[PDB]
């Protein structure tokens, strides 16, 4: 009937159209065959891999040289699912049109909370959360702002941090910005436009996001916890710093019970957030302290 | 004899073909078939869909937590009849090509009445109306434009309530906005004017409605009562808020007698148009106060 | 026909839907509504044999 | 439904078409009747496969 393989398709294409939430994640989503994927290489967090190899072959400093970057290059994704359940009793009325018009919301609010996890999450159940990973790189280095009492930083911090991963991030291809919507109101509709904030459309060109500094598309809000003590900014080169291993193409299973005449579906998802090296986002603080 | 059963598919089909008022007369349409499409579902309100589900998970606040939910998600219908005959009694000295002359006007009366019941309306027999919705939503927080004359014809109103519903939904898909003619000239061909409604296509690009204010197309349609107090906006995202459980494929009821110098062609319609969630529309505001 | 004057259309059917006020109510109406033409008409004086 | 009170279980059907006092009738009553049921918990297990 329905609640069946017949209706996972209009329950699974919602992933295809709304993995596309441009609110917190954009990477090369790795298509995964195995599961606990891992490489064993040491990435170029020290290389330097020829002088030519010449009359000298760099023998003195140093002997490896530094890290490294042998982590080793592991991957292990994360199951992600709401339980889905419809009125698994009442419709024998063949509405069907129903579960289209009923949900497309489960993948969605699934993704909503998923990006709350993405911006903000300590690594288990979720994969990597941004502000939690930002909460180890000293991304929220102290300070830049002045604790919710007329906070004054323009893209001044953005120039500073822009130097701080002007380090092995170049500039503005990609390198992007998330802020807060409190940050959208303390800076967008400022006069600044400090190179740009306002109006930040600024054509509107290719994909982009709402508002823009220096070229960088801009997201806000929510999943940024405000409370003055934060990153109210989120700057990183996405490309270098972080990537998406994503394994489980979508399965939901519409086996029945689950009793009391309301049965069981499960919005299963295994993707993963992972990176490489060291400190790759510096963002905040912006303190309450 | 005509006017009993000879042109009907005619009228339903041309009523499909000018169901066409880009103001509400298309929306999130459910071509319905139940009398009351009821369900007891709990959509995007409360969850927290997946969460990490591995360690701790939902153990303190709050359980339900807040809403929720329930409504229940009933979908009745509203009976949108007309009742205009003409006397076919001696108005019959070979006319017949009046059947390709008479009609047309009547569904025009239909759809105008339909829209003005649609945007302001009580639920008693109509749906509850969208301008009245914002009234019972109080979605209408004042002031932001000063009451017919020196009206601050801005868009920070728009931006404030834009992220307020972007606190609710998200941003810039769709987000829409129905204006007055007072707001038509008041935000067409003023200076700046505003965000963007210069040009007023505003590209045109999209599927279709005049104007585009960062994605908010501009609907006059002229049913706001002026007099300094009403909205002159309708800040909502369409593609979140309100669906149209549109019910019945119309049959006219061209009934013969009804005698003594008359006949009887009552006409019909049945749709419903129903709130999907909580508060997902704002408006004005702008009022007299 | 009756004009497109005065309505206010249906109560959509239950109990006593505004059953105290009103009914019909104003005009309304039935005008009635008869039309034809003037066979409107033009003519062009010029020189035509040459 | 045409409600309990308000009916007028009888109307004259031989005299005037409800005019003076009055034919409506009086008040009340009103509630939009509708009948969707409920479930009751009682589901049990006992000393089952013993």
XYZ file of C-alpha atoms in Angstrom:
678
model
C 0.000 0.000 0.000
C 1.358 3.235 1.116
C 3.692 3.572 4.036
C 5.711 1.443 1.631
C 8.665 1.339 -0.834
C 6.157 2.881 -3.152
C 6.231 5.955 -0.903
C 9.783 6.230 0.174
C 10.565 7.864 -3.149
C 8.561 11.005 -2.415
C 10.032 10.635 1.054
C 13.666 10.327 -0.119
C 13.897 12.877 -2.955
C 13.446 15.487 -0.179
C 17.054 14.728 0.709
C 18.151 15.606 -2.843
C 16.343 18.903 -2.723
C 17.221 19.664 0.875
C 20.541 18.438 1.560
C 20.524 21.840 -0.129
C 20.189 23.938 2.992
C 22.694 26.751 2.507
C 22.669 27.538 6.248
C 25.673 25.673 7.630
C 27.287 23.020 5.415
C 28.958 23.047 2.038
C 31.763 20.673 1.191
C 32.858 18.036 -1.180
C 30.426 15.429 -0.021
C 32.450 12.241 -0.289
C 30.497 9.355 -1.778
C 31.257 6.373 0.395
C 31.462 2.688 -0.503
C 32.820 0.974 2.668
C 32.085 2.430 6.114
C 34.948 3.064 8.556
C 36.936 4.740 5.814
C 40.524 5.675 6.607
C 43.641 6.739 4.811
C 47.096 6.362 6.263
C 48.863 9.283 4.694
C 50.590 12.133 6.396
C 49.285 15.329 4.801
C 51.325 18.352 4.006
C 51.394 20.138 7.335
C 55.143 20.353 6.975
C 55.905 19.938 3.309
C 58.119 21.258 1.462
C 58.784 18.216 -0.675
C 61.762 19.213 -2.841
C 64.608 21.669 -2.688
C 65.063 20.010 -5.917
C 66.101 17.028 -3.942
C 69.309 18.533 -5.293
C 72.976 18.637 -4.278
C 71.306 18.730 -0.834
C 68.244 16.879 0.312
C 67.232 18.881 3.412
C 69.010 16.810 6.023
C 69.211 19.064 9.104
C 66.070 20.813 10.409
C 63.964 18.925 10.644
C 63.775 15.099 10.700
C 60.145 14.601 9.694
C 59.758 17.766 9.838
C 56.801 18.602 12.089
C 53.332 17.160 12.134
C 52.727 15.795 9.746
C 50.019 15.098 9.174
C 49.501 11.516 10.225
C 46.267 11.541 12.197
C 45.684 8.788 10.724
C 43.106 9.787 8.190
C 40.127 8.006 9.732
C 36.400 8.280 8.996
C 33.428 6.849 10.928
C 30.015 8.380 10.218
C 26.947 8.808 12.296
C 23.441 7.359 12.171
C 20.911 10.204 12.011
C 17.166 9.675 12.051
C 13.984 10.951 13.509
C 11.364 8.301 13.959
C 8.673 8.965 11.422
C 5.089 7.967 12.016
C 1.856 8.960 10.361
C -1.733 8.424 11.446
C -1.124 4.754 10.748
C -4.744 3.848 11.458
C -7.197 6.356 10.116
C -6.377 6.533 6.417
C -7.585 3.547 4.716
C -9.051 6.426 2.648
C -6.280 6.286 0.018
C -5.436 9.957 0.461
C -1.787 9.432 -0.417
C -1.541 12.996 -1.741
C -1.489 13.271 2.007
C 2.022 12.186 2.765
C 3.481 14.409 0.124
C 1.411 17.322 1.395
C 1.650 16.017 4.926
C 5.344 15.937 5.355
C 8.190 16.977 3.319
C 9.100 18.323 6.718
C 10.778 15.347 8.239
C 13.877 15.458 6.028
C 13.512 19.165 6.589
C 13.304 19.545 10.364
C 15.649 16.613 10.398
C 18.028 18.812 8.487
C 17.215 21.777 10.714
C 18.294 20.096 13.871
C 21.043 18.434 11.814
C 22.538 21.791 11.144
C 22.072 22.809 14.730
C 24.283 19.838 15.302
C 26.546 20.858 12.441
C 27.224 24.296 13.807
C 27.297 23.094 17.335
C 27.910 19.556 18.488
C 30.342 17.488 20.517
C 31.085 14.819 17.990
C 29.116 11.776 19.080
C 25.724 10.940 17.588
C 26.373 13.883 15.421
C 29.671 14.044 13.659
C 31.590 17.226 13.924
C 29.968 20.384 15.210
C 31.419 23.699 14.186
C 31.350 25.764 17.375
C 32.472 22.763 19.304
C 35.349 22.375 16.893
C 35.656 26.126 17.082
C 35.753 25.478 20.811
C 39.092 23.730 20.495
C 41.047 25.768 17.920
C 40.717 28.879 20.115
C 38.598 30.175 17.225
C 36.816 32.165 19.901
C 40.050 33.894 20.933
C 39.573 36.780 23.338
C 38.496 39.258 22.472
C 37.032 41.244 19.725
C 33.711 42.573 20.973
C 32.561 44.272 24.075
C 29.720 42.204 25.638
C 26.382 43.297 24.119
C 26.871 46.940 25.014
C 27.167 48.659 21.637
C 29.604 46.277 20.012
C 31.881 48.030 17.621
C 33.878 45.621 15.451
C 33.247 46.067 11.741
C 35.201 43.650 9.618
C 38.139 44.736 11.755
C 38.292 41.347 13.380
C 37.685 39.893 9.952
C 40.871 41.528 8.768
C 42.695 40.233 11.850
C 41.443 36.651 11.618
C 41.779 36.971 7.822
C 45.440 37.345 8.552
C 45.299 34.645 11.165
C 44.451 32.045 8.596
C 46.179 34.111 6.055
C 48.455 31.277 6.899
C 47.299 28.680 4.600
C 44.078 30.235 3.631
C 44.331 32.645 0.772
C 41.616 35.144 0.278
C 38.147 35.030 -1.070
C 38.048 31.849 -3.172
C 36.364 30.364 -1.259
C 36.605 31.441 2.401
C 33.127 32.247 3.677
C 31.232 33.748 6.538
C 28.439 32.800 8.806
C 27.389 35.328 11.384
C 24.502 35.668 13.773
C 21.253 37.437 13.091
C 22.023 39.493 16.144
C 25.217 40.025 14.218
C 23.003 40.721 11.217
C 21.371 43.494 13.125
C 24.418 44.964 14.816
C 26.281 45.079 11.499
C 23.907 44.726 8.602
C 22.099 47.983 8.775
C 25.088 49.593 10.039
C 26.326 52.253 7.695
C 28.957 49.668 6.915
C 29.337 48.429 4.055
C 32.813 48.559 5.598
C 33.888 47.122 2.370
C 30.440 45.576 2.169
C 27.904 44.284 4.607
C 25.088 46.248 3.313
C 23.940 45.622 0.871
C 25.806 42.482 0.152
C 23.524 41.260 -2.634
C 25.804 42.348 -4.493
C 24.638 41.543 -7.910
C 23.009 38.954 -6.943
C 25.686 36.852 -8.654
C 26.089 33.039 -8.570
C 24.700 31.100 -5.586
C 25.741 33.399 -2.658
C 24.006 34.061 0.624
C 22.208 36.869 2.366
C 24.465 39.854 2.752
C 28.195 39.859 2.078
C 31.462 41.142 3.439
C 34.392 41.472 1.009
C 32.924 38.973 -1.396
C 32.029 36.411 1.261
C 28.420 35.098 1.277
C 26.851 35.364 4.712
C 24.495 33.282 6.862
C 23.186 34.129 10.342
C 21.274 32.983 13.337
C 19.834 30.471 15.802
C 22.383 27.723 15.942
C 24.755 30.547 16.824
C 24.031 30.926 20.514
C 24.040 34.643 21.185
C 24.609 35.683 24.831
C 27.514 38.030 23.929
C 30.058 35.274 24.710
C 30.271 33.705 21.264
C 31.546 33.516 17.831
C 29.077 35.842 16.284
C 31.074 35.323 13.156
C 32.157 32.156 11.452
C 35.077 32.403 9.095
C 37.037 29.511 7.658
C 38.048 28.354 4.310
C 35.512 25.572 3.869
C 37.657 23.998 1.157
C 40.787 23.512 3.130
C 39.286 23.442 6.590
C 36.723 20.606 6.660
C 34.936 18.167 4.345
C 31.892 15.898 4.119
C 32.256 12.251 4.096
C 28.706 11.151 3.393
C 27.865 7.495 3.342
C 24.270 6.439 3.740
C 22.139 7.382 0.831
C 18.709 7.701 2.345
C 16.809 4.718 3.703
C 13.579 4.935 5.635
C 11.809 1.733 6.454
C 8.042 1.510 6.529
C 7.595 -1.644 8.389
C 4.516 -1.407 10.559
C 4.282 -1.619 14.278
C 4.976 0.188 16.778
C 1.592 -0.469 18.355
C -1.468 1.538 19.385
C -2.350 1.671 15.682
C 0.487 4.027 14.889
C 3.422 2.428 13.137
C 7.113 3.064 12.405
C 9.380 4.865 9.943
C 12.919 6.095 10.520
C 14.739 8.802 8.651
C 18.093 7.072 8.644
C 21.165 9.012 7.622
C 24.913 8.428 7.848
C 27.025 11.339 6.663
C 30.007 12.795 8.385
C 31.741 16.039 9.041
C 35.540 15.791 9.024
C 38.582 17.931 8.234
C 42.332 17.476 8.171
C 44.976 19.483 9.960
C 44.920 21.998 12.785
C 43.255 25.371 13.382
C 41.154 26.259 10.344
C 38.423 28.477 11.630
C 39.002 31.459 13.854
C 35.790 33.213 14.755
C 34.797 35.188 17.831
C 35.133 36.041 20.615
C 33.062 38.522 20.982
C 32.669 37.832 24.682
C 30.328 38.301 27.637
C 33.460 37.944 29.704
C -33.937 24.513 -24.155
C -30.426 24.944 -22.935
C -29.214 25.904 -19.453
C -29.561 22.544 -17.773
C -26.675 20.508 -19.154
C -24.832 21.706 -22.242
C -22.028 24.031 -21.195
C -20.423 23.093 -17.914
C -16.999 21.612 -18.672
C -16.836 24.873 -20.432
C -17.322 26.722 -17.152
C -15.136 24.526 -14.956
C -12.351 24.574 -17.487
C -12.371 28.305 -18.004
C -12.579 28.564 -14.236
C -9.383 26.566 -14.103
C -8.057 28.889 -16.730
C -8.862 31.935 -14.687
C -8.506 30.588 -11.288
C -5.758 33.129 -12.057
C -5.445 35.855 -9.673
C -1.786 36.038 -8.527
C -2.780 37.163 -5.026
C -4.027 34.112 -3.288
C -6.043 32.419 -6.015
C -3.131 30.100 -6.432
C -1.480 28.723 -3.315
C -0.522 25.465 -1.637
C -3.393 23.706 -3.231
C -4.718 20.362 -2.190
C -7.218 19.193 -4.851
C -9.289 17.646 -2.130
C -11.920 14.910 -2.120
C -12.769 14.181 1.494
C -15.383 16.248 3.232
C -13.090 16.831 6.190
C -9.548 15.740 5.569
C -8.627 15.213 9.173
C -5.417 14.058 10.731
C -3.894 14.312 14.193
C -0.325 14.843 13.138
C 2.578 16.523 14.830
C 4.632 18.304 12.145
C 7.546 20.693 12.499
C 6.711 21.782 16.079
C 8.614 20.335 19.035
C 11.208 18.008 17.513
C 14.408 17.902 17.611
C 14.128 15.115 15.054
C 17.207 13.055 15.289
C 19.402 14.014 18.057
C 22.569 12.166 19.075
C 20.510 9.198 20.522
C 23.572 7.451 21.846
C 24.434 8.860 25.223
C 22.038 11.054 27.148
C 19.066 12.297 25.168
C 15.847 14.067 26.249
C 15.911 13.699 30.028
C 15.186 17.081 31.663
C 13.241 19.873 29.928
C 10.575 19.412 28.950
C 9.172 16.129 27.690
C 6.512 17.270 25.220
C 8.534 19.754 25.129
C 6.440 22.766 24.208
C 4.166 22.585 21.155
C 3.920 19.841 20.509
C 1.606 19.192 18.889
C -2.012 18.838 17.792
C -4.601 20.880 15.975
C -6.185 18.418 14.737
C -5.327 18.840 11.138
C -8.909 18.797 9.915
C -9.601 20.129 6.459
C -13.298 20.818 5.807
C -14.471 23.000 2.952
C -16.318 26.162 2.203
C -19.257 26.378 -0.152
C -18.739 29.034 -2.762
C -21.916 29.153 -4.726
C -23.429 31.597 -7.129
C -27.058 31.849 -8.048
C -27.693 33.934 -11.128
C -30.114 32.685 -13.676
C -31.599 34.469 -16.457
C -35.186 33.979 -17.553
C -35.080 31.593 -20.467
C -38.872 31.712 -20.702
C -39.517 34.071 -23.632
C -35.874 35.125 -23.942
C -35.591 32.406 -26.524
C -36.611 33.803 -29.941
C -33.504 31.966 -31.276
C -30.692 33.213 -29.098
C -28.374 30.267 -28.314
C -25.282 32.146 -29.431
C -25.975 34.023 -26.222
C -24.514 30.899 -24.655
C -21.344 32.128 -26.322
C -22.184 35.588 -25.022
C -23.859 35.371 -21.676
C -21.521 33.582 -19.305
C -17.995 34.595 -18.367
C -19.027 37.584 -16.212
C -20.385 35.160 -13.630
C -17.157 33.433 -12.683
C -15.616 36.852 -12.735
C -18.064 37.767 -9.988
C -17.087 34.438 -8.437
C -13.426 34.991 -8.260
C -13.513 38.581 -7.136
C -15.902 37.640 -4.373
C -13.671 34.652 -3.737
C -10.579 36.729 -3.212
C -12.177 39.373 -1.099
C -13.642 36.684 1.057
C -10.283 35.017 0.943
C -8.034 37.735 2.249
C -10.480 39.143 4.738
C -12.781 36.469 6.124
C -14.191 34.780 9.185
C -14.081 31.015 8.772
C -17.858 31.010 8.987
C -18.602 29.779 5.504
C -15.478 31.261 4.014
C -12.125 30.289 5.361
C -10.731 32.596 7.957
C -9.252 35.457 6.010
C -5.627 36.379 5.643
C -5.923 40.050 6.416
C -8.124 39.084 9.305
C -5.569 36.383 10.070
C -2.898 38.932 10.776
C -5.478 40.684 12.924
C -6.101 37.610 15.027
C -2.426 36.835 14.689
C -1.810 40.455 15.876
C 0.957 40.101 13.266
C 0.694 43.670 12.932
C 2.920 45.320 15.402
C 2.791 49.076 15.039
C 4.139 51.488 14.040
C 6.456 51.342 11.081
C 4.746 53.788 8.691
C 2.886 56.870 9.778
C -0.697 56.501 8.832
C -1.410 57.901 5.337
C 0.920 60.892 4.965
C 4.656 61.203 5.663
C 4.680 57.401 5.663
C 8.171 56.016 6.193
C 8.025 53.866 3.127
C 10.962 51.732 4.134
C 11.887 48.067 4.393
C 13.412 47.708 7.837
C 9.967 46.823 8.849
C 10.440 44.226 6.137
C 13.835 43.129 7.325
C 12.825 42.952 10.979
C 9.756 40.881 10.358
C 11.720 39.006 7.669
C 14.125 37.525 10.176
C 11.251 37.257 12.664
C 9.670 34.798 10.278
C 13.117 33.674 9.574
C 13.113 32.934 13.179
C 9.946 31.063 12.284
C 10.686 29.669 8.855
C 13.841 30.601 7.018
C 14.704 33.318 4.489
C 14.072 34.147 0.870
C 12.039 31.164 -0.290
C 9.483 32.377 -0.885
C 8.680 35.071 1.600
C 5.888 37.157 0.097
C 4.100 40.407 0.572
C 0.763 41.795 -0.439
C 0.571 45.560 -0.574
C -2.031 48.268 -1.006
C -2.345 50.625 -3.926
C -1.431 53.106 -1.283
C 1.553 50.866 -0.791
C 1.768 50.382 -4.567
C 2.613 53.982 -5.315
C 4.014 54.353 -1.800
C 6.604 51.774 -2.757
C 6.602 51.946 -6.482
C 8.281 54.966 -8.061
C 9.303 56.589 -4.881
C 13.014 57.140 -4.595
C 14.680 54.310 -2.668
C 12.092 52.431 -2.839
C 13.550 50.395 -1.105
C 15.400 47.291 -0.850
C 14.253 46.353 -4.353
C 10.925 46.946 -6.035
C 12.576 48.924 -8.629
C 12.280 47.533 -11.207
C 9.085 45.672 -10.340
C 9.365 42.589 -12.435
C 11.848 42.580 -10.486
C 13.779 40.461 -12.868
C 11.205 38.794 -13.730
C 12.924 35.391 -13.652
C 10.652 33.472 -11.240
C 7.386 31.620 -11.746
C 5.347 34.820 -11.407
C 4.152 37.868 -9.449
C 4.908 41.551 -10.079
C 7.672 42.988 -7.911
C 10.394 41.129 -5.971
C 11.750 42.527 -2.730
C 14.761 40.282 -2.244
C 12.364 37.562 -3.205
C 9.170 39.258 -2.072
C 6.878 39.926 -5.050
C 4.485 42.811 -4.775
C 0.781 42.219 -4.633
C -1.487 45.156 -4.707
C -4.839 43.491 -5.578
C -6.536 46.357 -3.673
C -8.464 45.027 -0.765
C -6.819 46.827 2.072
C -9.104 49.411 3.631
C -7.077 52.675 3.543
C -8.072 55.389 6.086
C -4.551 55.331 7.652
C -5.333 52.063 9.507
C -4.711 48.679 8.028
C -1.551 46.944 7.055
C -0.096 47.911 3.931
C 1.969 44.723 3.911
C 1.507 40.973 4.195
C 4.812 39.616 5.370
C 4.513 35.884 5.016
C 6.240 32.965 3.474
C 3.680 31.354 1.219
C 5.838 28.266 1.026
C 5.680 27.824 4.684
C 2.373 29.127 5.612
C -1.234 28.194 4.733
C -2.403 25.497 2.366
C -5.460 25.319 0.148
C -7.438 22.169 0.657
C -9.253 22.944 -2.565
C -12.198 20.708 -2.755
C -14.623 20.318 -5.566
C -14.718 20.353 -9.344
C -17.590 22.717 -9.916
C -20.965 21.832 -11.324
C -23.388 24.683 -12.088
C -26.943 23.869 -11.116
C -28.753 25.101 -14.172
C -32.141 24.089 -12.865
C -35.108 24.764 -15.107
C -38.138 25.788 -13.121
C -38.240 28.122 -11.012
C -41.028 29.181 -13.322
C -43.254 32.255 -13.824
C -41.020 34.653 -15.809
C -37.750 33.010 -14.658
C -35.346 30.034 -14.549
C -32.503 28.958 -12.113
C -28.792 28.445 -12.749
C -27.187 28.370 -9.347
C -23.450 27.952 -9.636
C -21.019 26.591 -7.132
C -17.572 26.156 -5.816
C -16.044 24.303 -2.889
C -12.513 24.757 -1.631
C -10.902 25.260 1.665
C -7.746 27.126 2.510
C -6.184 26.319 5.775
C -3.488 27.447 8.167
C -0.679 24.976 8.312
C 0.949 25.914 11.560
C 1.252 28.598 14.199
C 2.037 32.237 13.371
C 3.684 32.334 9.962
C 2.406 35.574 8.511
C 3.085 39.197 9.505
C 1.725 42.385 8.028
C 2.094 46.137 7.805
C 2.658 47.701 10.157
C 1.955 50.738 9.446
C -1.503 51.484 10.668
C -3.166 54.693 11.849
C -1.309 54.049 15.050
C -30.479 39.425 -14.446
C -30.351 40.967 -11.175
C -27.556 43.528 -10.824
C -24.200 42.916 -9.243
C -25.492 45.244 -6.534
C -25.858 44.799 -2.790
C -24.339 41.346 -2.218
C -22.671 39.899 0.115
C -22.940 36.244 -0.877
C -23.880 32.959 0.901
C -23.937 31.607 4.337
C -22.487 28.210 3.424
C -25.341 26.184 4.968
C -26.010 24.857 8.504
C -28.465 26.227 11.040
C -29.691 29.866 10.930
C -26.912 31.663 9.075
C -27.769 35.315 9.551
C -31.419 34.221 9.641
C -32.638 37.411 11.334
C -30.893 39.874 8.992
C -31.308 40.358 6.197
C -32.677 38.859 2.987
C -32.592 39.788 -0.764
C -32.003 42.705 0.444
C -31.580 45.969 -1.431
C -31.424 46.317 -5.219
C -30.220 43.868 -6.042
C -32.182 43.385 -8.353
C -33.698 42.932 -11.841
C -33.272 46.002 -13.978
C -34.096 44.337 -16.533
C -31.307 44.582 -18.998
C -32.213 44.972 -22.700
C -29.756 46.122 -25.339
C -29.363 46.400 -29.038
C -27.480 48.840 -31.198
C -27.482 51.693 -33.408
C -26.464 50.326 -36.771
C -23.504 52.650 -36.756
C -22.412 53.749 -40.058
C -20.023 55.613 -42.338
C -19.832 56.853 -45.913
C -17.153 58.369 -48.063
C -17.965 61.095 -50.518
C -15.330 61.290 -53.215
C -14.927 61.289 -56.991
C -15.380 57.792 -58.162
C -16.167 57.586 -61.850
C -12.664 58.799 -62.747
C -28.521 20.054 12.748
C -31.601 22.144 13.199
C -31.195 22.212 16.960
C -33.363 20.782 19.779
C -34.379 24.121 21.241
C -35.091 26.398 18.316
C -37.225 23.641 17.041
C -40.348 24.184 16.823
C -41.005 20.475 16.667
C -44.385 21.471 15.315
C -45.230 24.175 12.857
C -48.887 24.760 11.982
C -48.944 23.532 8.315
C -52.479 24.924 7.905
C -52.155 28.537 9.074
C -49.667 31.327 8.374
C -46.051 30.856 7.392
C -44.510 31.744 10.782
C -44.990 35.457 11.374
C -46.132 36.881 14.728
C -44.816 34.965 17.750
C -42.847 33.944 15.658
C -41.409 30.734 14.358
C -37.687 30.312 14.998
C -38.025 29.480 18.075
C -36.010 30.627 21.109
C -32.624 29.869 22.564
C -30.607 27.844 22.280
C -28.930 25.706 21.361
C -25.697 25.448 19.404
C -22.608 23.260 19.034
C -21.207 22.135 15.672
C -21.791 18.409 16.079
C -19.202 16.015 14.737
C -18.326 12.501 15.741
C -14.701 11.344 15.642
C -14.006 8.632 18.198
C -11.324 7.924 20.786
C -9.174 4.950 21.857
C -9.180 3.447 25.378
C -6.192 1.690 26.920
C -6.858 -1.822 28.214
C -4.433 -3.893 26.167
C -3.118 -6.685 28.334
C -0.913 -9.732 28.670
C -1.257 -12.349 31.372
C 0.371 -15.678 32.316
C 0.597 -16.092 28.588
C 2.425 -19.053 27.047
C 2.323 -21.026 30.323
